[PDB]
Amino acid sequence: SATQGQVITCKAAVAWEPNKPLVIEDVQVAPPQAGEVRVKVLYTALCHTDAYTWSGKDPEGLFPCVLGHEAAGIVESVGEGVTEVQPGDHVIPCYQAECRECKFCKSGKTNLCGKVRAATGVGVMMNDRKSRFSINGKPIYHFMGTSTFSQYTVVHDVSVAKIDPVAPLEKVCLLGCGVPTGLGAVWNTAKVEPGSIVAVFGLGTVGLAVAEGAKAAGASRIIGIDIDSKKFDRAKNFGVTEFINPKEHEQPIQQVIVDLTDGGVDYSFECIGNVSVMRSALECCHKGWGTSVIVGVAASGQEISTRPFQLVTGRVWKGTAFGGFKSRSQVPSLVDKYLKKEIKVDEYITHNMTLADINKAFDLMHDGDCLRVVLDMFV
Amino acid sequence: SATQGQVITCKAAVAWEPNKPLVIEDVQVAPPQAGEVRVKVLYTALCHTDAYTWSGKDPEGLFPCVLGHEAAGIVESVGEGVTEVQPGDHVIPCYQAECRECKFCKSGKTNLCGKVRAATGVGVMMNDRKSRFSINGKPIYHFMGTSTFSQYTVVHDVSVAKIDPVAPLEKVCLLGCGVPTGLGAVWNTAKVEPGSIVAVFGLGTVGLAVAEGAKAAGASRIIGIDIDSKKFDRAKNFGVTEFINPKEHEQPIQQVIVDLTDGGVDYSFECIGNVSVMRSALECCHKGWGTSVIVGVAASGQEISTRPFQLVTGRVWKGTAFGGFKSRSQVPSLVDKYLKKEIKVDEYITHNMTLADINKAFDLMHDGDCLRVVLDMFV
Numbered sequence: 001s002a003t004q005g006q007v008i009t010c011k012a013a014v015a016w017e018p019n020k021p022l023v024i025e026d027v028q029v030a031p032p033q034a035g036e037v038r039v040k041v042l043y044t045a046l047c048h049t050d051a052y053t054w055s056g057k058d059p060e061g062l063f064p065c066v067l068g069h070e071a072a073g074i075v076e077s078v079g080e081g082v083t084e085v086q087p088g089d090h091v092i093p094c095y096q097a098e099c100r101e102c103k104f105c106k107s108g109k110t111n112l113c114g115k116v117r118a119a120t121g122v123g124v125m126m127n128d129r130k131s132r133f134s135i136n137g138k139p140i141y142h143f144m145g146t147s148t149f150s151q152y153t154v155v156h157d158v159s160v161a162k163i164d165p166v167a168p169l170e171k172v173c174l175l176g177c178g179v180p181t182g183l184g185a186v187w188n189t190a191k192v193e194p195g196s197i198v199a200v201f202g203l204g205t206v207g208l209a210v211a212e213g214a215k216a217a218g219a220s221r222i223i224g225i226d227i228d229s230k231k232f233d234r235a236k237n238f239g240v241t242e243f244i245n246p247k248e249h250e251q252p253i254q255q256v257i258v259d260l261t262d263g264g265v266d267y268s269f270e271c272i273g274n275v276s277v278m279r280s281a282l283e284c285c286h287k288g289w290g291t292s293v294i295v296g297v298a299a300s301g302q303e304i305s306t307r308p309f310q311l312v313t314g315r316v317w318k319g320t321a322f323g324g325f326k327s328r329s330q331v332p333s334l335v336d337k338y339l340k341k342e343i344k345v346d347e348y349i350t351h352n353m354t355l356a357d358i359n360k361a362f363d364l365m366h367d368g369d370c371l372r373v374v375l376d377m378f379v
Numbered sequence: 380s381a382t383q384g385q386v387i388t389c390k391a392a393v394a395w396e397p398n399k400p401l402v403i404e405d406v407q408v409a410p411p412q413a414g415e416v417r418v419k420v421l422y423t424a425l426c427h428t429d430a431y432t433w434s435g436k437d438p439e440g441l442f443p444c445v446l447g448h449e450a451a452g453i454v455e456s457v458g459e460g461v462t463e464v465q466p467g468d469h470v471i472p473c474y475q476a477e478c479r480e481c482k483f484c485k486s487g488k489t490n491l492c493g494k495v496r497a498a499t500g501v502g503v504m505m506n507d508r509k510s511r512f513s514i515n516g517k518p519i520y521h522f523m524g525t526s527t528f529s530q531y532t533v534v535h536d537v538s539v540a541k542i543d544p545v546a547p548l549e550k551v552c553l554l555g556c557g558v559p560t561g562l563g564a565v566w567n568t569a570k571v572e573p574g575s576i577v578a579v580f581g582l583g584t585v586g587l588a589v590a591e592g593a594k595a596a597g598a599s600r601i602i603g604i605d606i607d608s609k610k611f612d613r614a615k616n617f618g619v620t621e622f623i624n625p626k627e628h629e630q631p632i633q634q635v636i637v638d639l640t641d642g643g644v645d646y647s648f649e650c651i652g653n654v655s656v657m658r659s660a661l662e663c664c665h666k667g668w669g670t671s672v673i674v675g676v677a678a679s680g681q682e683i684s685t686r687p688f689q690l691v692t693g694r695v696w697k698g699t700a701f702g703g704f705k706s707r708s709q710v711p712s713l714v715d716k717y718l719k720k721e722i723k724v725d726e727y728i729t730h731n732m733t734l735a736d737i738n739k740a741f742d743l744m745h746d747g748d749c750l751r752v753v754l755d756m757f758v
């Protein structure tokens with residue numbers, strides 16, 4: 001690399017303050033330190049998690065920052081002691097790290113490695129507890145250990161998945177968040193059996209991946225719930241067999257579902273981040289065995305509630321983070337499955353735009369009429 | 380049987396109103412109809428659930444009623460179609476029925492048979508939708524399908540566990556509720572693995588059985604939490620290895636437990652019925668895999684709450700009903716384990732009294748100066 005050891009000056013979409021449109025700035029991206037990787041971000045996708053922090057409803061939120069966490073690109077350079085990746089490798093930076101050596105990593109019970117959490121949680125790098133981004137010497141915080149809204153980003157080596165170089169980067173950028181979250185919520189978290197009756201609450205990218213996961217798992221019925229009836233038609237291609245719009249019914253949604261399933265569903269998945277809907281997803285589950293998985297991310301201060309008899313009578317309340325997938329170990333497999341036509345990726349993308357269109361893309365995101373928007377960072 | 384086909388006049392502890400002392404009355408106990416069994420209740424133990432309903436805090440509480448659900452006795456007579464039990468058999472009447480043929484019984488995922496619930500949940504028998512108890516021609520409702528505070532009671536055949544006739548009825552009456560509840564909360568519900576770190580909230584009979592269950596499960600640490608330090612001393616014999624009294628700490632109890640366990644326990648059991656303590660028990664679980672089992676029965680209208688983040692970060696919220704044990708199929712096996720000294724039963728009994736002392740026995744329970752109190756019905 002022509003830039004090895006040097007401070008890079010590139011374009012980045014900077015979130016200067018909450019609710020303010022992103023400003024495309026020239027930022028300085030410092031070289032990778034010990035155990036870090038500088039990535040050329042070719043393509044990034046937009047997620048509701050980016051907008052959630054941008055909105056100001058996030059307690060972890062630090063301003064000014066470079067948002068974005070769903071991307072794919074190429075290793076520009078590596079810091080001291082980095083050997084798992086090298087300049088030129090095709091990678092997916094992940095918000096979920098995998099150090100492969102801690103209690104969380106070694107016990108096949110969870111994917112939640114906490115090695116770099118103290119650093120990533122505060123918009124900084126572990127090696128020096130500083131950000132690698134600056135404008136006129138002043139720091140711009142990192143976001144979710146990824147900051148993929150920058151042409152160049154610096155991430156911890158433990159968060160870098162090395163992928164198949166033939167994979168189309170404008171597609172595989174979705175394998176860093178939404179699609180594995182939905183798929184894994186079914187396969188890893190719930191472990192849905194064939195014949196199961198599944199309810200999916202919210203038919204956005206995540207809800208659709210849950211439907212594809214449940215179809216792959218051999219569910220007999222996939223009930224799609226969304227307040228927007230226009231989202232029902234596209235859902236059928238993702239495996240959804242039945243539809244309910246809660247606004248079309250005076251009785252609580254949980255009652256409507258119990259009334260169609262002879263007692264309730266085997267599995268429910270809340271793919272919105274709405275606490276009232278989380279309670280409904282639990283209560284629509286069948287007595288004795290019904291399991292509800294929260295996939296959606298609620299705003300800070302919101303609490304879930306139910307009457308404890310729902311649990312005493314056999315319902316199970318749980319949740320998922322990145323579908324329970326181990327980033328460095330499993331994202332490369334999801335890419336291989338995608339390349340081998342075992343899983344859908346392309347179908348979740350409704351728009352391709354450029355970095356300059358970032359605000360226009362967040363406007364599409366607010367309106368609800370899109371699935372994933374992919375940004376070409378270098379055009 | 381001298382009383383076959385006939386109405387029995389016997390003594391019963393009747394609860395006329397919530398919160399008023401139990402009155403010993405002469406009651407008429409009609410003969411069993413199709414599918415029913417009339418039992419001579421030799422011994423009955425008092426449970427917190429009996430006091431829970433008497434205190435007016437049960438959503439299903441009906442008055443006047445004959446309370447009691449932990450008993451052991453002898454089959455006096457059987458109704459038409461009854462073949463599994465016959466006069467003279469030693470039995471344990473169970474509040475959790477097992478028809479062996481329904482959706483729940485055949486599922487293999489639960490013990491929550493709902494065959495006779497339309498009747499027991501409303502203080503009546505299924506055959507004629509009427510009670511078998513009356514005073515001056517006026518009905519006295521059944522309670523939990525058992526009504527063991529009566530010398531003679533009529534139960535559904537699907538709620539009768541036939542047991543080894545050598546088993547002492549003054550001990551095995553406990554195998555109808557509290558002891559299998561705690562043991563099973565561990566073995567069936569949580570499925571605690573060897574080396575697990577366990578937190579038991581409330582060190583009453585149920586909490587102590589959870590400690591015995593966890594000890595048999597090969598747990599490395601059993602943390603006993605109780606607001607009464609007096610309950611700690613006897614708890615050591617049941618497997619409790621460490622003690623915490625929440626009143627001795629300014630920080631919330633979950634924080635105290637997390638501090639002592641390097642992030643939280645593997646399994647927590649709430650054995651009280653207090654919704655704030657239920658939230659604490661969930662929050663004291665280790666991120667990624669920690670599981671909380673609600674065992675305690677909460678008051679009407681009380682709700683459990685937490686931040687959805689607790690579940691998204693891997694904690695599992697579940698509950699148990701009769702420790703997940705199949706009544707007719709498994710209660711005889713537990714009586715066999717007890718006689719083999721594989722399980723403790725005797726150790727949970729602190730007092731033996733007579734039916735006439737029922738009110739004295741509940742006052743003793745209110746003061747927290749006992750575990751199980753066994754009433755001799757016929758002396």
Ligand SMILES: NC(=O)c1ccc[n+]([C@@H]2O[C@H](COP(=O)([O-])OP(=O)(O)OC[C@H]3O[C@@H](n4cnc5c(N)ncnc54)[C@H](O)[C@@H]3O)[C@@H](O)[C@H]2O)c1
Nearest residue numbers: 181202203204205206226227271272273295296297321322
């Ligand atoms: N846990 C994880 O690791 C993780 C990962 C990725 C995304 N997420 C979360 O998943 C959620 C969904 O992501 P997405 O990209 O699919 O978003 P989205 O906006 O495209 O989808 C949300 C859907 O829910 C619908 N909806 C809104 N309110 C509803 C209600 N009351 N009842 C029914 N439907 C309702 C909307 O119409 C929309 O179709 C977000 O909260 C996101 O933060 C979590």
Ligand SMILES: NC(=O)c1ccc[n+]([C@@H]2O[C@H](COP(=O)([O-])OP(=O)(O)OC[C@H]3O[C@@H](n4cnc5c(N)ncnc54)[C@H](O)[C@@H]3O)[C@@H](O)[C@H]2O)c1
Nearest residue numbers: 427560581583584585605606650651652674675676700701
């Ligand atoms: N789920 C089931 O199938 C089932 C079956 C049997 C019993 N139960 C329930 O189990 C519960 C306990 O039964 P038991 O007979 O062991 O009761 P118990 O009264 O003997 O014991 C309760 C204990 O909780 C302690 N306690 C109270 N508040 C506390 C707090 N804030 N923090 C810590 N400790 C606290 C008390 O000091 C007491 O020792 C009851 O709610 C009963 O209904 C449930």
Ligand SMILES: [Zn+2]
Nearest residue numbers: 047049177178
């Ligand atoms: Zn995302």
Ligand SMILES: [Zn+2]
Nearest residue numbers: 099102105113
């Ligand atoms: Zn790790």
Ligand SMILES: [Zn+2]
Nearest residue numbers: 478481484492
């Ligand atoms: Zn049944």
Ligand SMILES: [Zn+2]
Nearest residue numbers: 426428556557
């Ligand atoms: Zn009981």
